[PDB]
């Protein structure tokens, strides 16, 4: 079919690689492709260089490192629950200073996780994503003192876990104070430690009259750098002996030590640019030729005094400015934890160096790799920034990798997070999407990288612009930080151009974010595209300019939740970004070079290229993702087909011919229907189920272990006590359900027997035993069964055993068995549907086709959406989408309508006219005139002022059709809807929230250990929480017995719940409640606090709730 | 008043601070055990240091550590650094922690509880329903009313008895 695209704006550059933020970061951190001698001082190499050399006389030094090949490929790691990783070797040499003896060896430090091609990790078989962090960039800042106006705070901030924040403040008593580790002390003391003479400080700070006088203290200058140093040491360390070398050690470690104190490279640069100086190292001072020399302190003090005085060219700082906020990507975070683990390894090394034999010590004996391994593993497992990858659809992964978080280690906590940091700063333009953020507690804290946005080597987000010289717009593209962007007047991307020249007398631009109308002579730069303002998700919403931001947020977020459909289709109205997303996400398989297709299979595509070489591509088939969505690739080519470079070989999940397919294109009518669409509920046609629209494959994995116990071994077998052959029907010889069998709740996936816990049979059991003459078996049925509400076809079985080749399990485990079950999910009532404009709803009704509103030609609508959802929501994009959707229905074409450079009403009207001719003229030729019902509806619409009086029925019907409205017949009556109804094609997705996953119920089930209350959650077969507020509801109703049941009979009252169940199965009314067990737990826990809690009667006599069991 | 000093520190019943074998045969246990173990180790070492006639600095250190141990047991992190398990920054959960807070005994287990005969699901509009009615999915009802259903199954020929009915609904 034909794809017609709108808009005049020609994008100069394409979108950058969208996963580059992960990929280039980690690649930069590892430097695996760089030969060791050519490596830079950045990355894990940096950590090695900071840790080593290790001294104190033995000395352990670092030569180089290397990363080996991964012991296992990614797939094998996924199946065996391994981690995709490379062995890390480090060449070290021990040198005894006195002896001169040098022992050199390459030691094995364990493994490091490798990033996959798509920018994710495989940790213990599960795919994870390390999310970029946003934080305050290190440097020197000047902020208004909130209490006293006219006074300011100078804060010196290093990298996280790189040493203390230092504050500088002019006190009301006139003296300048320094704050370190919450210690306020006169700065002049440290100034003296740096070896500053009063004359130098006087000539330097003299320009500011009142302040430098407050700086002057003669008791300090009467001292010496040594005496001042020891004084400061006594100030920072009360009780600690003021030894000279110890004071030098402490102050050096606090300020001048590069290993203990680190400003980033960015902190270095920003400090330099702000204070107008040049930094030697990344510290605030140095230890040179035996004494200390100042770097940051004096320039900071100078600037602070200058700002306080009012001296021009001195301003406070906007800490929310994106020039002052940087990003820590995967490489930096991983490198950080690497540095920590390395430090621990070093501590161990010094230990062994002191303790070990002096004659023979190898680096192998000195180095224990364990702490480092632990640090890395901990980072990739228990870190908040290490998240379970969202694979629901390819766009979910792509978007997840592009996420930015203000939370995590060294970041904000949601308590410390106020409105300011959650705001959309003007500087977010082109950098951080203003639209896509969570609605709830994380709002503004979790954000998304803009489409054209890039993170520089310093960690600042940069957006592209275009050089404009003399009103001529070049193709030269410049990526600036926010600080650089602030220096220019930047024209909007929609400013009218003839050729490369701007033609308008007046152009709309930004100067430091401020909108301004300027002449073309004033334009320095121009935007690349409206696309650059938003995220990859937001860029997928057509007619975005017609949607309120609040619903754009919802559409964005919800696209992430779209489930891959077997029949999945690209939107009828696209934004033009649909293919790049598929490509960058590595969802689809593409042709490497120009060539010819040799072989096409469900499992394989073999291509012969220009090189004459035969390259075979295996297709991933019905693989289970993290969210249980089926990820499978289907061949889109055929045998003998010629393919050029970058051609599509195969469609992955949610991809139709290389275009992103997140849902279906359905025919909607926008009308109320019998209350079934009330309050956002949605009505659909059974025709959608008939043709398998919104049907999705989901695969669930079940797992069981058979282990060695002290009572005898558990074992996986087909022999299950007290079970018929009907139950073992689908079980194979070994006890595992056979591939292809259909399983329902209660069915056995894997047979397992376990030796019984030691028990003396109760006399009832003994008598019954003798009566039936059957020996009591010593094993019981532990078999893994299909949980309630689940089931499907078994598509896989994996069996690993101890004693099997290449297989070693965790200690005590004899064998592990997994069973993969696939299910085909049709759309059903309660499933969540949504469009890209933020219109979401749960399917409340599925009508048979004959009940559906239909067009006069007999065509029933697919979906009925309530118009009441439009006005308060203010997302009109869906309406336009529908209108155009109508046109493309009858013209049989799809559209690209770029955001903010769109399809416009008149164009849609033209298309609708052509479409109308297609929709009507056909009828007129078919020998049918205008219908009576059509006449009535035309009269009605004529009263509404929709059509002009005096025109022919055809003319009026066309007048309506241009408004996107058509006559519609009630399927139940045959009489038409009194008004003409808006009908057209809309792109609707089936979200990951499905009632099949959420429906849960329990009578009784497992209880908690200590509290004896029901467990929570569906997976545990748990009870719903009746919380304080539910209790308040029952209290407010004055329903005492319902409440008391909640508190006792239905939860933690043991005797009560038992007696209640028995009473109900007997048919008796439920017995009176007893003491809830958790109250006894409270009493006994208060007793453990040495408080005596006594339940008393009206006689003030003790009452025993433990019934003598607790009393001697 | 002197009862505000502890000569004999009470010990919670073990079931309230369980040592339990989880599914895989591995053990999981409450922090209170580790706190109590610190306490008992320090106390015992104190008695042995006393009996052996130790110098005053040592006994002083030991007593201080004993007081801090008791502190950690009763309210952890109340005074001084919170006691943590080896290789973790996580504070151990003491009796005070157990009692108070949103996760505390009162608010979590006392003023509110998880309950039986309860369920949840997605909601859908009811337009045909009368005001006093709600649509309830069949299976949810089968589970929620389950004992009643066993009873009624026995009242008819549907099952010989309750246990047969339940095994039938399995």
């Amino acid at each position: 079919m034909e794809i017609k695209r709108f808009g005049r704006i020609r994008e100069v550059i394409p979108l950058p690689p969208l996963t580059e933020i992960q990929v280039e970061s980690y690649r930069r951190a590892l430097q695996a492709d760089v030969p060791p001698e050519k490596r830079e001082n950045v990355g894990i190499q940096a950590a090695f260089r900071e840790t080593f050399p290790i001294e104190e006389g033995l000395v352990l030094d670092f030569l180089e490192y290397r990363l080996g090949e991964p012991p296992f490929p990614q797939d094998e790691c996924r199946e065996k629950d391994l981690t995709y990783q490379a062995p890390l070797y480090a060449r070290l040499q021990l040198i005894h200073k006195d002896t001169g003896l040098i022992k050199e060896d390459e030691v094995f430090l364990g493994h490091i996780p490798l990033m996959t091609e798509d920018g994710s990790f495989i940790i213990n078989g599960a795919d994870r994503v390390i999310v970029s962090q946003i934080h305050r960039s290190p440097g020197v800042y000047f902020t208004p003192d909130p209490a006293r106006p006219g006074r300011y705070i100078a804060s010196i901030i290093p990298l996280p876990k790189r040493g203390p924040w230092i504050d500088l403040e002019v006190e009301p008593n006139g003296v300048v104070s320094m704050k370190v580790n919450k210690r306020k002390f006169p700065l002049v003391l440290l100034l003296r430690v740096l070896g500053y003479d009063q004359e130098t400080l006087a000539r330097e700070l003299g320009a500011y009259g009142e302040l430098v006088q407050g700086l002057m203290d003669e008791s300090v200058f009467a001292m010496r750098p040594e005496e001042a140093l020891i004084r400061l040491f006594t100030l920072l360390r009360p009780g600690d002996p003021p030894k000279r070398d110890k004071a030098v050690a402490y102050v050096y470690g606090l300020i001048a030590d590069p290993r203990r104190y680190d400003l980033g490279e960015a902190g270095r640069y920003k400090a330099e640019e702000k204070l107008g100086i040049r930094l030697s190292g990344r510290t605030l001072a140095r230890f040179e030729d035996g004494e200390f020399k100042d770097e940051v302190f004096l320039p900071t003090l100078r600037y602070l005094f200058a700002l306080t005085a009012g001296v021009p060219g001195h301003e406070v700082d906007d800490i929310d400015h994106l020039g002052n906020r940087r990003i820590r990507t995967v490489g930096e975070l991983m490198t950080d934890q690497f540095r920590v683990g390395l430090a621990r390894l070093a501590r161990g090394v010094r230990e062994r160096m002191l303790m070990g034999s002096e004659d023979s010590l190898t680096p192998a004996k000195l180095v224990n790799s364990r702490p480092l391994e632990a640090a890395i593993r901990e980072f990739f497992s228990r870190s908040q920034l290490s998240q379970f990858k969202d694979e629901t659809n390819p766009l979910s992964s792509l978007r997840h990798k592009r996420r930015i978080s203000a939370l995590g280690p060294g970041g904000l906590t949601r308590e410390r997070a106020g409105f300011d940091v959650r705001d959309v700063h003007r500087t977010h333009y082109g950098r951080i999407c203003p639209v896509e953020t969570p609605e709830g507690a994380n709002i503004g804290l979790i954000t998304s990288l803009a489409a054209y946005a890039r993170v520089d080597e310093l960690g600042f987000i940069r957006t592209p612009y275009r050089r404009v010289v003399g009103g001529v717009v070049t193709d030269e593209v410049v990526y600036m930080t926010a600080t650089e962007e602030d220096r220019y007047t930047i024209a909007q991307a929609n400013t009218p151009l003839e050729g490369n020249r701007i033609a308008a007398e007046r152009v709309v631009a930004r100067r430091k974010g401020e909108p301004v109308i300027v002449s073309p002579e004033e334009v320095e730069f121009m935007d690349v595209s409206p696309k650059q303002v938003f995220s990859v998700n937001t860029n997928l919403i057509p007619f975005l300019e017609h949607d309120d931001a609040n619903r754009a947020l919802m559409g964005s977020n919800m696209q992430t939740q779209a489930v891959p459909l077997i029949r999945a289709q690209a939107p009828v109205v696209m934004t033009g970004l649909e293919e790049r997303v598929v490509r960058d996400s590595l969802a689809a398989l593409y042709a490497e070079e120009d060539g010819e297709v040799a072989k096409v299979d469900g499992n394989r595509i073999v291509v012969r290229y220009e090189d004459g070489r035969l390259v075979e591509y295996p297709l991933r088939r019905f693989y289970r993702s993290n969210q249980g969505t089926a990820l499978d690739q289907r061949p889109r080519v055929v045998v003998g087909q010629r393919v050029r470079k970058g051609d599509l070989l195969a469609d992955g999940p949610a991809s139709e011919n290389g275009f992103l397919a997140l849902g279906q294109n359905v025919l909607v009518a926008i009308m109320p229907f019998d209350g079934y669409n009330f309050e956002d509920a949605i009505v659909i046609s059974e025709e959608l189920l008939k043709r398998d629209f919104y049907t999705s494959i989901h695969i669930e994995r079940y797992e069981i272990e058979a282990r060695d116990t002290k009572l005898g071994p558990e074992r996986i077998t087909r022999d299950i006590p007290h079970l018929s052959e009907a139950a073992l029907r689908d079980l194979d010889e070994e006890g595992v359900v056979r591939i292809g069998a259909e399983v329902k709740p209660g069915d056995i996936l894997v047979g397992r027997t376990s030796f019984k816990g030691e028990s003396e049979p109760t006399p009832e059991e003994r008598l019954l035993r003798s009566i039936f003459g059957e020996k009591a078996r010593d094993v019981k049925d532990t078999s893994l069964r299909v949980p309630p509400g689940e089931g499907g076809i078994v598509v896989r079985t994996v069996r690993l055993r101890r004693g099997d080749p290449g297989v070693e399990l965790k200690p005590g485990v004899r064998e592990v068995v997994r069973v993969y079950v696939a299910q085909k999910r049709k759309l059903q009532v309660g499933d969540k549907l949504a469009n890209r404009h933020g219109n979401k709803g749960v399917v409340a009704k599925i009508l048979p086709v004959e009940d559906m509103p239909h067009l006069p030609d007999g065509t029933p609508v697919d979906v009925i959406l309530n118009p009441l959802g439009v006005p308060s929501r203010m997302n009109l994009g869906q309406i336009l989408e529908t209108h155009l959707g109508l046109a493309g229905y009858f013209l049989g074409q799809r559209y690209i309508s770029p955001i903010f450079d769109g399809a416009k009403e008149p164009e849609i009207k033209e298309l609708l006219a052509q479409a109308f001719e297609v929709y009507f003229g056909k009828r007129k030729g078919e020998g049918f005139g205008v219908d009576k019902r059509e006449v009535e509806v035309l009269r009605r619409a004529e009263k509404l002022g929709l059509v002009t009086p005096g025109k022919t029925p055809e003319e009026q019907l066309k007048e309506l059709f241009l408004q996107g409205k058509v006559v519609l017949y009630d399927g139940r009556t045959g009489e038409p809807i009194e008004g003409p109804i808006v009908v057209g094609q809309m792109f609707i997705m089936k979200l990951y929230h499905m009632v099949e996953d959420k429906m849960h119920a329990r009578s009784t089930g497992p209880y908690s250990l200590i509290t004896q209350q029901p467990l929570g959650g569906k997976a545990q077969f748990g009870g719903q929480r009746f919380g304080e507020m539910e209790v308040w509801a029952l209290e407010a109703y004055g329903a005492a017995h319902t409440l008391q049941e909640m508190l006792t009979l239905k939860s933690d009252d043991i005797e009560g719940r038992n007696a209640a169940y028995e009473a109900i199965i007997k048919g008796e009314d439920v017995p009176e409640p007893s003491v809830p067990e958790s109250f006894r737990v409270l009493v006994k826990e208060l007793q453990a606090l040495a408080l005596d809690v006594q339940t008393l009667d009206e006689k003030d006599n003790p009452v025993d709730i433990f019934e003598g069991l607790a009393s001697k | 008043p002197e009862w505000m000093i502890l000569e004999a520190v009470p010990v919670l019943p073990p079931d309230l601070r369980p040592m339990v074998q989880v599914d895989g045969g591995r053990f999981a246990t409450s922090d209170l055990n580790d706190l109590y173990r610190r306490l008992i180790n320090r106390n015992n070492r104190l008695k042995k240091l006393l009996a052996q006639g130790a110098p005053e600095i040592i006994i002083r250190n030991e007593k201080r550590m004993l007081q801090e141990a008791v502190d950690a047991l009763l309210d952890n992190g109340r005074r001084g650094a919170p006691v943590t398990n080896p290789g973790s920054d996580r504070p151990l959960r003491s009796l005070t922690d157990i009692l108070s807070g949103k996760q505390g005994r009162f608010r979590q287990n006392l003023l509110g509880k998880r309950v039986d005969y309860s369920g949840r699901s997605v909601i859908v509009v009811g337009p045909q329903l009368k005001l006093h009615q709600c649509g309830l999915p069949k299976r949810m009802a089968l589970e929620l009313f389950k004992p009643f259903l066993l009873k009624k199954m026995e009242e008819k020929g549907i099952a010989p008895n309750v246990k047969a009915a339940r095994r039938m609904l399995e």
Partner: peptide, 14 residues
């Protein structure tokens, strides 16, 4: 305040 520091002081006495 810091028990280790305190003890190291008491040790630093003798």
């Amino acid at each position: 305040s810091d028990p280790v520091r305190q003890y190291l002081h008491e040790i630093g006495q003798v």
